[PDB]
Design a protein around this ligand. Structure first.
Ligand code: CL
Ligand code: CL
Ligand code: CL
Ligand code: CL
Ligand code: CL
Ligand code: NA
Length: 129
């Protein structure tokens, strides 16, 4: 599923991401845009052999099981395939664990490089929420 900008903002808000660990909603929409272009089916392989999955590009090196990342962990205790669903629940719940891991949203390189320090409220501008 490819979400619209405001449809994703609304879904993230309903799943409790607005100001989760202090990160306003625009931060989450911004990171999703750059990670996946709002596409729940996005996948990308990392240089180490792990793979990032879904709208928030969550890495099988630590967070999910895909059966093909040796030495990896499954800290969200989910198959990586669950992060590709049209329903974002699994991605949001895992993202809540990631963002609490000590580094905040710096856990997503793309947030640090493309969202941090910018006007992230623009990502939810005009949305009826
Ligand atoms: Cl957009
Ligand atoms: Cl915001
Ligand atoms: Cl594995
Ligand atoms: Cl959803
Ligand atoms: Cl923080
Ligand atoms: Na894993």
């Amino acid at each position: 599923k490819v979400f619209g900008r405001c449809e994703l903002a609304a879904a993230m808000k309903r799943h409790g991401l607005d100001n989760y660990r202090g990160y306003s909603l625009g931060n989450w929409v911004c990171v999703a845009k750059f990670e996946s272009n709002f596409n729940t089916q996005a996948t990308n392989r990392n240089t180490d052999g792990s793979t990032d999955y879904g709208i928030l590009q969550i890495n099988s090196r630590w967070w999910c099981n895909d059966g093909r990342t040796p030495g990896s962990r499954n800290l969200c205790n989910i198959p990586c395939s669950a992060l590709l669903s049209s329903d974002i629940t699994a991605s949001v719940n895992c993202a809540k664990k990631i963002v609490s891991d000590g580094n905040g949203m710096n856990a997503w390189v793309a947030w640090r490089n493309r969202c941090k320090g910018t006007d992230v409220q623009a990502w939810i501008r005009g949305c009826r929420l």
